[PDB]
């Protein structure tokens, strides 16, 4: 069972550097051709760097001279060390296995978002969306930078029938979002509904109980 975990993603200043880790399972990094693939928000997939079995390294002309792809044979972890970062480098980064002949990129990391901006981190406000046969209730995650926020309900228990909307960029320069979840009206009295908003960039982790008004 191949599993590719990724770490390192987040907010960096333009001009800055950032390292990403891709811990492997089920195969050997050293002998395989490995790749970094990135995807800018709302755009297609761009290949970044390949590292051959023989140690040869090839890069896209965009990252050439700034990025180093390197393998740690012993740890099984794989790395992408980035330098001279620009807004154009903002993207979700993917580690994936490249086949030399004509084969496959069979497995993929879950991906890790990298935001290149000089704007300071801001934690969100979490306001309740008050429910008043069927009840709609949610939480409003307002004024935060940058993305993402992870909105769950009841510590990942209430996963069914949830709509957490894609975030809009307000003129202010801060993102805002709402997360709704339709529930049986009979369970208003018994079952309490709490949204859990986690925002790693500001280390914010708000729990908010939503009750009918």
């Amino acid at each position: 069972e191949v599993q590719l975990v990724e770490t390192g993603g987040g907010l960096i200043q333009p001009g800055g550097s950032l390292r990403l880790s891709c811990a492997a399972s089920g195969f050997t990094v050293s002998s395989n051709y490995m790749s970094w693939v990135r995807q800018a928000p709302g755009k297609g997939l761009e290949w970044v760097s390949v590292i051959y079995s023989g140690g040869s390294t090839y890069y896209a002309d965009s990252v050439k001279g700034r990025f180093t792809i390197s393998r740690d044979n012993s740890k099984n972890t794989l790395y992408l060390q980035m330098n001279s970062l620009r807004a154009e480098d903002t993207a979700v980064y993917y580690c994936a296995r490249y086949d030399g002949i004509y084969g496959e990129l069979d497995f993929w990391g879950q991906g890790t978002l990298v935001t290149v901006s000089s704007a300071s981190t801001k934690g969100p406000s979490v306001f309740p969306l008050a429910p008043s046969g069927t009840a709609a209730l949610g939480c409003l995650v307002k004024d935060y930078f940058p993305e993402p926020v992870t909105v769950s309900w009841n510590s990942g228990a209430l996963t069914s029938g949830v709509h957490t909307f894609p975030a809009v960029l307000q003129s202010s320069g801060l993102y805002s979002l709402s997360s709704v979840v339709t529930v049986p009206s009979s369970s208003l009295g018994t079952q309490t509904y709490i949204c859990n908003v986690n925002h790693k960039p500001s280390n914010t982790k708000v729990d908010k109980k939503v009750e009918p008004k």
Binding site: V37, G44, Y102, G103, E104, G111, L140
Partner: protein, 211 residues
């Protein structure tokens, strides 16, 4: 170094229909061409390698074919969960090039929205800002007109909407319109109306509340 020209850019088809996706190369790539499926907010998922060969785990409905410059991905009978973007890619000469993708939408039957309205919270009123959120829930098609009226007066340039990605189960969209106004503006007026026009409605629906 060879650019790929995927076609069409978007495909909208109903469950049970055959879907045909094309990838055209400016320069031969013989048979070196791959196919991936990407859903909203997820890693890509390989489908086909070497133009014609289905990758491990990939269900029967997906298939590939072609050699030279013209290539083809087919989904024999579409499923509600096939809502995704689909990528072609070549690995003959350097640098490796991906295609721009084909967006596939699932074309279900007309579903009218359920409309809710949400007065700004007491917590929020302390800050001096007032968000009024209107919700259009589980509707199809995507096209929906939302109108804000405050004391029967049209609002303009103080609203932002976002739409969820298609529901992989019933293929419907939901829509969130947030009206943003000052604490003081919210208390000078009384009635907060959200009017919705949709194909699924025989007439526009207005949801409203008193402050």
């Amino acid at each position: 170094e060879i650019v790929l020209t995927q076609s069409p850019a978007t495909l909208s088809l109903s469950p049970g229909e055959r879907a045909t996706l094309s990838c055209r190369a400016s320069q031969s790539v013989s048979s070196y061409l791959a196919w991936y499926q990407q859903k909203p907010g997820q890693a890509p998922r390989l489908l086909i390698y070497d133009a014609s060969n289905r990758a491990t785990g990939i269900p029967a409905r997906f298939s590939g074919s072609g050699s030279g410059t013209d290539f083809t991905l087919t989904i024999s009978s579409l499923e509600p969960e096939d809502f995704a973007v689909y990528y072609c890619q070549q690995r003959s000469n350097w640098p490796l090039t991906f295609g721009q993708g084909t967006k596939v939408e699932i074309k279900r039957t007309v579903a009218a929205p359920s409309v809710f309205i949400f007065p700004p919270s007491d917590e929020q009123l302390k800050s001096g800002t007032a968000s009024v959120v209107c919700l259009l829930n589980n509707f199809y098609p995507r096209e929906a007109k939302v109108q804000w009226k405050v004391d029967n007066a049209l609002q303009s340039g103080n609203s932002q909407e976002s739409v969820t990605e298609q529901d992989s189960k019933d293929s419907t969209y939901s829509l969130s319109s947030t009206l943003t106004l000052s604490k003081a503006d919210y208390e000078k007026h009384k009635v907060y109306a959200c009017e919705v026009t949709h194909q699924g409605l025989s007439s526009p629906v207005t949801k409203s509340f008193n402050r």
